Amino acid sequence: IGAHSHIRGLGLDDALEPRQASQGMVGQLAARRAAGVVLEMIREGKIAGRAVLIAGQPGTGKTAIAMGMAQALGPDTPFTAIAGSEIFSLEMSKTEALTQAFRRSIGVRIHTVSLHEIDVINSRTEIKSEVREQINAKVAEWREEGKAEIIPGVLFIDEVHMLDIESFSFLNRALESDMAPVLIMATNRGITRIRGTSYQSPHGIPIDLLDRLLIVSTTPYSEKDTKQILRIRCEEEDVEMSEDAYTVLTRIGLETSLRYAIQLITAASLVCRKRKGTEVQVDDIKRVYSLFLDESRSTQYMKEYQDAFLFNELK
Amino acid sequence: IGAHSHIRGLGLDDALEPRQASQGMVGQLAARRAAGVVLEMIREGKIAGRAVLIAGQPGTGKTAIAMGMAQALGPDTPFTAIAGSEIFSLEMSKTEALTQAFRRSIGVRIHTVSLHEIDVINSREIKSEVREQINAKVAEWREEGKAEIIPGVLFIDEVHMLDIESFSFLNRALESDMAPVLIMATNRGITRIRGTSYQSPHGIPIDLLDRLLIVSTTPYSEKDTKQILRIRCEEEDVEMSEDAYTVLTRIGLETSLRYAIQLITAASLVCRKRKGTEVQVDDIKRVYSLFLDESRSTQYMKEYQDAFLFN
Amino acid sequence: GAHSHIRGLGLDDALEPRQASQGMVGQLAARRAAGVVLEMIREGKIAGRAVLIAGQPGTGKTAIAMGMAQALGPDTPFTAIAGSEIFSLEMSKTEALTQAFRRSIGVRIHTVSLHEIDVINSREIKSEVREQINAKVAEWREEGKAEIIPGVLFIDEVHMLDIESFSFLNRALESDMAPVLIMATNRGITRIRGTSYQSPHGIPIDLLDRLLIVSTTPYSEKDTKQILRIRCEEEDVEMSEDAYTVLTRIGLETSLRYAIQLITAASLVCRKRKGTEVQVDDIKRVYSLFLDESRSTQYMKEYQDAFLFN
Amino acid sequence: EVKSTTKTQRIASHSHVKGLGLDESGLAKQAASGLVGQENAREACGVIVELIKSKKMAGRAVLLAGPPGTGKTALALAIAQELGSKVPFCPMVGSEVYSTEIKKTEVLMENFRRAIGLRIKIIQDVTLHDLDVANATEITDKLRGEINKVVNKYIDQGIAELVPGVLFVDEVHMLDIECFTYLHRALESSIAPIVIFASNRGNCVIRGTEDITSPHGIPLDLLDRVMIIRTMLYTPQEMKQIIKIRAQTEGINISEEALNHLGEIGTKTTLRYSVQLLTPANLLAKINGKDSIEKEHVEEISELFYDAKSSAKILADQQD
Amino acid sequence: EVKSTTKTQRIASHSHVKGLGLDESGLAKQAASGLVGQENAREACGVIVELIKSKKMAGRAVLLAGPPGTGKTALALAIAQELGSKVPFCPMVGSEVYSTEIKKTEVLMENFRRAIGLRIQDVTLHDLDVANARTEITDKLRGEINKVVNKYIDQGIAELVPGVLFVDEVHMLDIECFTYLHRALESSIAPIVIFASNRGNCVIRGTEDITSPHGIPLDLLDRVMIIRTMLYTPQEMKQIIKIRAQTEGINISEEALNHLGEIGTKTTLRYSVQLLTPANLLAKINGKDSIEKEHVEEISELFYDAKSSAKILADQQDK
Amino acid sequence: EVKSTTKTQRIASHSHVKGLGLDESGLAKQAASGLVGQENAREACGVIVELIKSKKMAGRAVLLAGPPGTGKTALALAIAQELGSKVPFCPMVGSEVYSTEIKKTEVLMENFRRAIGLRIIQDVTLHDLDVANARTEITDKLRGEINKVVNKYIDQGIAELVPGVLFVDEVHMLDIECFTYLHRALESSIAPIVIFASNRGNCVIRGTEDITSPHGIPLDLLDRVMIIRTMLYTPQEMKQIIKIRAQTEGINISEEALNHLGEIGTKTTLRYSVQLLTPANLLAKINGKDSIEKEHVEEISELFYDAKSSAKILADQQ
Numbered sequence A: 001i002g003a004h005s006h007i008r009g010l011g012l013d014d015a016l017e018p019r020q021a022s023q024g025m026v027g028q029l030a031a032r033r034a035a036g037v038v039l040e041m042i043r044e045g046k047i048a049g050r051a052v053l054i055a056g057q058p059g060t061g062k063t064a065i066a067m068g069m070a071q072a073l074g075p076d077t078p079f080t081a082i083a084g085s086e087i088f089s090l091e092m093s094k095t096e097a098l099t100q101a102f103r104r105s106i107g108v109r110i111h112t113v114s115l116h117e118i119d120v121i122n123s124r125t126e127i128k129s130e131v132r133e134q135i136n137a138k139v140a141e142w143r144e145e146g147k148a149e150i151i152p153g154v155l156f157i158d159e160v161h162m163l164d165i166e167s168f169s170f171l172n173r174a175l176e177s178d179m180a181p182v183l184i185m186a187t188n189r190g191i192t193r194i195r196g197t198s199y200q201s202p203h204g205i206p207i208d209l210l211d212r213l214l215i216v217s218t219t220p221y222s223e224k225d226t227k228q229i230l231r232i233r234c235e236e237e238d239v240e241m242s243e244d245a246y247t248v249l250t251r252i253g254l255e256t257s258l259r260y261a262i263q264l265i266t267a268a269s270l271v272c273r274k275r276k277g278t279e280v281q282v283d284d285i286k287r288v289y290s291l292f293l294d295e296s297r298s299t300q301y302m303k304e305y306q307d308a309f310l311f312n313e314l315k
Numbered sequence B: 001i002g003a004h005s006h007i008r009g010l011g012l013d014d015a016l017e018p019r020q021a022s023q024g025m026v027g028q029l030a031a032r033r034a035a036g037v038v039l040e041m042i043r044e045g046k047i048a049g050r051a052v053l054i055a056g057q058p059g060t061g062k063t064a065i066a067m068g069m070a071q072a073l074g075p076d077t078p079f080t081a082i083a084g085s086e087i088f089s090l091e092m093s094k095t096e097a098l099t100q101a102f103r104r105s106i107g108v109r110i111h112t113v114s115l116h117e118i119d120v121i122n123s124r125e126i127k128s129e130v131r132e133q134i135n136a137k138v139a140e141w142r143e144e145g146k147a148e149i150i151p152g153v154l155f156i157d158e159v160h161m162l163d164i165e166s167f168s169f170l171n172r173a174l175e176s177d178m179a180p181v182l183i184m185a186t187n188r189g190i191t192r193i194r195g196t197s198y199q200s201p202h203g204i205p206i207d208l209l210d211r212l213l214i215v216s217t218t219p220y221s222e223k224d225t226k227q228i229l230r231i232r233c234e235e236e237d238v239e240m241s242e243d244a245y246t247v248l249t250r251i252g253l254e255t256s257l258r259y260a261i262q263l264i265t266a267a268s269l270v271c272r273k274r275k276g277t278e279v280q281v282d283d284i285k286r287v288y289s290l291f292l293d294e295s296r297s298t299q300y301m302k303e304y305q306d307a308f309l310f311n
Numbered sequence C: 001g002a003h004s005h006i007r008g009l010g011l012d013d014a015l016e017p018r019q020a021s022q023g024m025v026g027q028l029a030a031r032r033a034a035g036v037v038l039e040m041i042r043e044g045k046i047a048g049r050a051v052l053i054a055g056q057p058g059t060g061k062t063a064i065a066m067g068m069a070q071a072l073g074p075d076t077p078f079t080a081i082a083g084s085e086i087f088s089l090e091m092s093k094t095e096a097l098t099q100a101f102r103r104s105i106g107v108r109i110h111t112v113s114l115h116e117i118d119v120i121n122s123r124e125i126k127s128e129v130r131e132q133i134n135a136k137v138a139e140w141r142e143e144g145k146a147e148i149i150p151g152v153l154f155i156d157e158v159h160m161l162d163i164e165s166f167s168f169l170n171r172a173l174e175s176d177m178a179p180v181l182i183m184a185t186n187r188g189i190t191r192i193r194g195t196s197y198q199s200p201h202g203i204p205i206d207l208l209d210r211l212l213i214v215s216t217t218p219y220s221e222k223d224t225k226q227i228l229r230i231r232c233e234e235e236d237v238e239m240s241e242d243a244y245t246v247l248t249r250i251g252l253e254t255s256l257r258y259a260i261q262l263i264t265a266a267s268l269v270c271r272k273r274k275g276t277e278v279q280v281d282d283i284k285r286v287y288s289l290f291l292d293e294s295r296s297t298q299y300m301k302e303y304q305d306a307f308l309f310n
Numbered sequence D: 001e002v003k004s005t006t007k008t009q010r011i012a013s014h015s016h017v018k019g020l021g022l023d024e025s026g027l028a029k030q031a032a033s034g035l036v037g038q039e040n041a042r043e044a045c046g047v048i049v050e051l052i053k054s055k056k057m058a059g060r061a062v063l064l065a066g067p068p069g070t071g072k073t074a075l076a077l078a079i080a081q082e083l084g085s086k087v088p089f090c091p092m093v094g095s096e097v098y099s100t101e102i103k104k105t106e107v108l109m110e111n112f113r114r115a116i117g118l119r120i121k122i123i124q125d126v127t128l129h130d131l132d133v134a135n136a137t138e139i140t141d142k143l144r145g146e147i148n149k150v151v152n153k154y155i156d157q158g159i160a161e162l163v164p165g166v167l168f169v170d171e172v173h174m175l176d177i178e179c180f181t182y183l184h185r186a187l188e189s190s191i192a193p194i195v196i197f198a199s200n201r202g203n204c205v206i207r208g209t210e211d212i213t214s215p216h217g218i219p220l221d222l223l224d225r226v227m228i229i230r231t232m233l234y235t236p237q238e239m240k241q242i243i244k245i246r247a248q249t250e251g252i253n254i255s256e257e258a259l260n261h262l263g264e265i266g267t268k269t270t271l272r273y274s275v276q277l278l279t280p281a282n283l284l285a286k287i288n289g290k291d292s293i294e295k296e297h298v299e300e301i302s303e304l305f306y307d308a309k310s311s312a313k314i315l316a317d318q319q320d
Numbered sequence E: 001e002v003k004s005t006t007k008t009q010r011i012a013s014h015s016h017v018k019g020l021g022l023d024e025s026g027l028a029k030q031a032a033s034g035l036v037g038q039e040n041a042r043e044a045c046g047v048i049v050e051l052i053k054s055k056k057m058a059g060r061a062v063l064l065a066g067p068p069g070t071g072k073t074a075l076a077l078a079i080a081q082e083l084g085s086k087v088p089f090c091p092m093v094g095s096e097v098y099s100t101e102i103k104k105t106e107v108l109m110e111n112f113r114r115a116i117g118l119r120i121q122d123v124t125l126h127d128l129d130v131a132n133a134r135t136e137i138t139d140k141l142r143g144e145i146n147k148v149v150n151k152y153i154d155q156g157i158a159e160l161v162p163g164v165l166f167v168d169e170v171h172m173l174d175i176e177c178f179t180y181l182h183r184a185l186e187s188s189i190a191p192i193v194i195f196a197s198n199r200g201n202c203v204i205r206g207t208e209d210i211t212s213p214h215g216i217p218l219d220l221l222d223r224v225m226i227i228r229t230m231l232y233t234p235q236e237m238k239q240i241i242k243i244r245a246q247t248e249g250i251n252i253s254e255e256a257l258n259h260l261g262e263i264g265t266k267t268t269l270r271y272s273v274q275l276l277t278p279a280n281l282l283a284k285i286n287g288k289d290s291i292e293k294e295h296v297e298e299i300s301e302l303f304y305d306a307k308s309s310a311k312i313l314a315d316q317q318d319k
Numbered sequence F: 001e002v003k004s005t006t007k008t009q010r011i012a013s014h015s016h017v018k019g020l021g022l023d024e025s026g027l028a029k030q031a032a033s034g035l036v037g038q039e040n041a042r043e044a045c046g047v048i049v050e051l052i053k054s055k056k057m058a059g060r061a062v063l064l065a066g067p068p069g070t071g072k073t074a075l076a077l078a079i080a081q082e083l084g085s086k087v088p089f090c091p092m093v094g095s096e097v098y099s100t101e102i103k104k105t106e107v108l109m110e111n112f113r114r115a116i117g118l119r120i121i122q123d124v125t126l127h128d129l130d131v132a133n134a135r136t137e138i139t140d141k142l143r144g145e146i147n148k149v150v151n152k153y154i155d156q157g158i159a160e161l162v163p164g165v166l167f168v169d170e171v172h173m174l175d176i177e178c179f180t181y182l183h184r185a186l187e188s189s190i191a192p193i194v195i196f197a198s199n200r201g202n203c204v205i206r207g208t209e210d211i212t213s214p215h216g217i218p219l220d221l222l223d224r225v226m227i228i229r230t231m232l233y234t235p236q237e238m239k240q241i242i243k244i245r246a247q248t249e250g251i252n253i254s255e256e257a258l259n260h261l262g263e264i265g266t267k268t269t270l271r272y273s274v275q276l277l278t279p280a281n282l283l284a285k286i287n288g289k290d291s292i293e294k295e296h297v298e299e300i301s302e303l304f305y306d307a308k309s310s311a312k313i314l315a316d317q318q
């Protein structure tokens, strides 16, 4: 089961106004409306030489908004979401990792198949430079024939601040293509040094690329919006839960993270299943919270430990 | 038109005493005299295992003195002036860049042709085998008597740019019998030696410093600056008013001689664009407002960055 | 040799140190603990373990390691290397360490180290050559014509090793014929080379957690004299008692290494004037001639500091 | 036959820049040839134009030093316009040289070839790079040697004439010591384009030196051969003026109230940010069934979308 | 036929750990299945076990976070016990990837293959790799075994049993290794990856600037479930040391055990347990049936713990 | 036949150094064998000489620790002179190993081969034999051929091996890997006597970044090293050395000029002072003068600078 399984589009009306709860989206109104304006630009073909940045704290639906945009663009539109750190591979070049990420977001119609799938099919049965060169000529023939349609999708780069200039320059060259997908990046970082450079820049993105961005901000969720997201996620993970439990899990979510709160659903349901239960109660959420820790509690304990042994270095 | 086109020699008498204004050289007296004593050493053959360092602030005639020495050595003597940063190439090894710089300064008489030209002729970085053949070819011509090896002058400006790897190359390079007279320039005092964690005067390893004849250039007065500008105008074929020279030298002293000279070409165009006949103060004044000196260029950038930091 | 006098640990049956026995003087606690380690090697209870001798320089860390190797057997292979020795122009850190390990693993026929067998069937050693010898020795062993006798590998200046080499030792000690690894250092908490992390003795925590850590305490005037007295006997140097009194003072004030270094030089000064035995004037003169690493530096500090004031 | 390699996405924002807008004497007009204000930098570019034409730019390059969104690129394009139309203009960013699959020399070689053109005598206007792709497996330096021999024979015959253009290098502090050495050497050639640098920084460490700080991050050897022109921030009147040209160019109707607000957004952020709001603001108006952009549309787009500085600030404040 | 590649020297210290010792409901017992105390971490591992068995550990990993010598390894081994006896358990240290002669990918590939087994013959995927090479274990040889194994599964002669891959000193893996793990963790036939940490926020190796919890990239850390292990009470300390003594067949007086327990409080439980062998040999030398207080006291004086041995030096270096 | 590879430009400054100038007992004389003052370091070198001759330098090396221009090189050359004349002496600088076209091992192997000689009476070094066989390039395959030839000549009795002195200046410049190459070579029976030189105190060992040790020498190697301190000369010892140099080179100098040239030494280094002799002589020759007078020295000292003062001029202007 996918994390954004509930997201079926941006859920805005004809006037690009967000509906509070529609198409799997909840709240995050301003960002959803701005994402809608971007859609109109993709459709009107006014997105050339531009990209999207979704700047916001973790668990504010940056990926969910990006997913929504891909759903709203079409039911077959290729969506690829990757982390910045994912391109730093033992078995792959940063660019080859990014090339794969790009070709995953570019579709070919017959049934729709991504350029990357076509590469894997005519490979292992990193991708060969000659193989891609053949497919690029193959798809050029099919397109000019009219038997195939090139449908550019959405490429989402989470943790974008993880990229270096070498990879940032790759994206510029990549977006020069006519079949280039709509690049949407995300970060929770402000002014940071650009990796591979001695220079600092907003979100750690080179100024030349920032000057071409449509920057969107995701604001943090309220108790109401958090509950609604958990309520939706339970439905997707097929988890029945009490209202007093939702009240507690949202509190946990607000005090910790939405990720941690969602992480507890699967575990809380098992605790409940192990005793009959029928639906997850407060005691179930409470017990599962004591069992598994959030990254903040986890580090606080380790800090307390390491700091106490450092004071030992004196006595 | 070249920057040192006016420099025809060191402008010294038989007793190696500088003439204030001679052979295209103005003032810079002690360094010129010192450069003359170095020539006597090259001539007597007492320069083996030694080199020259012209240490001085930018625009004090370090290159001009190096140029005057090369002119004074002979009309055919090979002179090669390179920047320290020029050896850091995309299409070339630091040493291969330096090898080319050295072979450009070593001549072969037949019409004099540098060893480097002979390499380029029998080539299109140059092949290791190609140089090895030419080195054997020139060895035959020399022992025959049909060719004469005439070592010249290699000038390395911004010398502090070089790392130990390249500094060690120069030591090996100067071991050769046909090695040119290495003259190096810098405006840097104690700096770390590139490629090392150690600091040394001028960023030069102590082993090489212990072998140098260090010549120091002192900055120019209002009089000497005017005379250099006056000379440069003559070379660039620019007529200028006396009141304008007064202003341009002031600009030169307050900024740099490079910037003051850079203005000549621009000021003459401003003048030419309105008839003028000769460059006036308002021409120098206008061209100063148009084009910036690097000091002004950065000060404005500091003011910008600092204003956005406060707001 | 520097440890020519060391003929064992000089312990009784109850593993109690004898103060002066088998070439060993004082350093009692460190010696007794080394004896406990021997019992573990013999009882086959040393698997997945290694030894560390933490102690200041010239406290017999190498001497104790030698005493253990002497006590294990007369034929037991002992190899002592410095940490810095693996950082070679003509050799891989691991290949340097592979050689160090194969030098400490013996083969009985006359006993010959695995490394000697490599050199014989060679002139870094070829990967294919070792692979053949490893199969060759496997046949001889299973036949019964040869006996594998694991010895002692001593890595002095251990803090010099990086994680790449520390990981090699872990893989190396996994072998059944692996020698007893004895490491020594004079360093407390230091960064692990190749890492941004600090650890006692600059050793990774995973390896530290497996170590039997012995501590060598510094020598007294009595113990220092006894070591020099022993070293003179080995270097065949006759010396006056008044001279021994001075040389031990020099030793305590400087290092035992430096006081030992002077013996050879002092005897030559004496030989150059008849003498018969080294006198105080001989030790005094040789001290003025050659400097100890600390006086050497103090003079270099005094120089640099004087030019800083001018 | 030609094909044109030209990266139109780049020069798209300057479609309105048709020259320097100088008078017969050489003085700038408030608004002329698409350019508004920035009179002094424009006048200085005029001198640069005459020096290029008078063959007095012997080994010299140009640096445009000014804050972002002050028309440094627009001026470099205007210089190319003024050199006579169909003169190549190749805008690039210092960071382009840093690619994993393509060598630094190959990024630079291509951009230089993109900046040197040919006039064949209908008159065909081709760049040296258009000819490179016209031949092609992959653009090797062996293929470059073939074109260079062909081109050199056409010149000597008199069928074609070589037109060196303008190579604009933005974010100069991003080039490394080795790239500057490649530029300086190319800048010494007779058939080279006029290299135009652009900086918005002061003293910088030269990339590849780690310790060495020099003005604009340019080695002093090259900087001695460079002529600096200062670009300045626009007044709110000059701001509205530029934004209006862009709106007109794009065929976008905007109310004077909306333009005034869009002018003050520029003052707060950059002119580039303000100009870029026009497209979304127009689409919002079209959605609302409106002929032109009104203040509400601009205000709404300015609230939905952010500028790097303010979006990064939002985060840092939430984090504190 | 089998051979078993298993590095027994590693798991040797945990020979006594036979399971989590939880009751029918899922609550821990003071002492059961070899485990003493650490009840909450044990109960949390119980949930992890049921989630693995219920196929609910979809792309999820586990991190055990606690001070050294608090049974993080013992628990990771107990998880593997609780999964089904002859279920592979591959304990490794983050620093293992750093070798001069062997590639990072090859160290990781081997350890993953060492953690995925086959089923009655019980073989791991790595035992099969060596059975063929006894030139060198190439990825071409791996492709042959993978085709053989996949045909056996579809036929029904053999069944694939994914085990536990325990990675200690996690802060030691570099950004590229985490990318290799994360990708492997996405596979259906992957083992359950269990990380271990006693560190807080660390710079991610290969980033130089970037600090994240336990040195794990946030991308991977979001897929990670954290269980906290804690320091043992002096009563629990003596209890564990006694199990170890019994396991090794070592007799120890209650007075000696009490002292050996308090040594553990001062140092670590690991240090205390390790003193048993030398303390026993000293007793055997002294012709004694069991370890007495004197023996423990003598061994504790002759041998040191890294912290106190390093302190001795630093103090001598001050004087 | 011989050719002699010897880099004469190096040893040229020490043409006057003919030995240690010690008396029958082993004490130094104020001035003897070309050496002036530096009595204690000279006496210490005397012991080193006897230890080399008595085969007691078993794996041991030497370090002359002292300020620049205190005869560390002159002493290392005198050690080679005292070992018997025609004993190889190979002076080198730690930074020589850092070359782009030549491997560190190759720089070191050449200098070691340059420091081990042969007596056939023909006096050849192992490196002279290497070039003789090459006059493609000196490969280690060519080295194996010479080594077999040389070893058969020794066993026959036609030639005898004479290990010399390898002088390594600016020791703090060698990296951890070079020291490992030296230490290993220093363990050989047929090795030269390695003589290090340092004007530095504690240094980071090159290739370690964090690790500081005396003179930048790894402690493993430093334990096998014997330290001899060289000290600064008084203006009189200074003047005496300069006078010897002037005489050697065949340059006439007034005592007044020599007194000033001695005090220039005190202000800068002895090396700087000695180097002023050639330009000062040429200035006198230009002025049509038989000898160097005070004016000539004063003029040369004003026109030319010493690295320290020329760098200071810059920093002060800055």
Ligand SMILES: Nc1ncnc2c1ncn2[C@@H]1O[C@H](COP(=O)(O)OP(=O)(O)OP(=O)(O)O)[C@@H](O)[C@H]1O
Binding pocket: A003, A004, A005, A007, A024, A025, A026, A027, A028, A056, A057, A058, A059, A060, A061, A062, A063, A064, A065, A158, A186, A218, A229, A232, A233, A258, A259, E222
């Ligand atoms: N406005 C929203 N409406 C519906 N579901 C949402 C919304 N925001 C977040 N979610 C859901 O909550 C979870 C967290 O959202 P998401 O992963 O997009 O956050 P994020 O800001 O991208 O942070 P990160 O990816 O770094 O963890 C997902 O399962 C996502 O689908």
Ligand SMILES: Nc1ncnc2c1ncn2[C@@H]1O[C@H](COP(=O)(O)OP(=O)(O)OP(=O)(O)O)[C@@H](O)[C@H]1O
Binding pocket: C002, C003, C004, C006, C023, C024, C025, C026, C027, C055, C056, C057, C058, C059, C060, C061, C062, C063, C064, C156, C184, C216, C227, C230, C231, C256, C257, C260, F223
């Ligand atoms: N307890 C001892 N009994 C006899 N000889 C000893 C003793 N301790 C040291 N020595 C001798 O004194 C010298 C120095 O000892 P050793 O080399 O082992 O010290 P260390 O602690 O290992 O320091 P390092 O090897 O770093 O110089 C050697 O010749 C050694 O044999």
Ligand SMILES: Nc1ncnc2c1ncn2[C@@H]1O[C@H](COP(=O)(O)OP(=O)(O)OP(=O)(O)O)[C@@H](O)[C@H]1O
Binding pocket: A211, D013, D014, D015, D017, D034, D035, D036, D037, D038, D066, D067, D068, D069, D070, D071, D072, D073, D074, D075, D198, D231, D242, D246, D271, D272, D275
């Ligand atoms: N003086 C001007 N007159 C007319 N249009 C201008 C003027 N200056 C700038 N523009 C236009 O305003 C926009 C921003 O200017 P430009 O892109 O050239 O500035 P910049 O200083 O080079 O910085 P950056 O490229 O980083 O945004 C472009 O659309 C440009 O064409």
Ligand SMILES: Nc1ncnc2c1ncn2[C@@H]1O[C@H](COP(=O)(O)OP(=O)(O)OP(=O)(O)O)[C@@H](O)[C@H]1O
Binding pocket: C209, E013, E014, E015, E017, E034, E035, E036, E037, E038, E066, E067, E068, E069, E070, E071, E072, E073, E074, E075, E196, E240, E243, E244, E269, E270, E273
């Ligand atoms: N709760 C427990 N019950 C029984 N034995 C335990 C328990 N905890 C630990 N042990 C045992 O005590 C010793 C130390 O525990 P372990 O090695 O698993 O701890 P750790 O926290 O992983 O740290 P480290 O591996 O660095 O020493 C081992 O012998 C282990 O089997």
Ligand SMILES: Nc1ncnc2c1ncn2[C@@H]1O[C@H](COP(=O)(O)OP(=O)(O)OP(=O)(O)O)[C@@H](O)[C@H]1O
Binding pocket: B210, F013, F014, F015, F017, F034, F035, F036, F037, F038, F066, F067, F068, F069, F070, F071, F072, F073, F074, F075, F197, F241, F245, F270, F271, F274
């Ligand atoms: N005691 C001495 N007696 C005679 N000549 C000496 C004496 N000391 C030095 N010299 C000579 O003075 C000069 C400088 O000495 P030397 O070059 O050996 O010193 P250094 O300490 O090794 O430093 P550096 O090589 O960096 O200049 C040389 O010409 C040398 O031969």
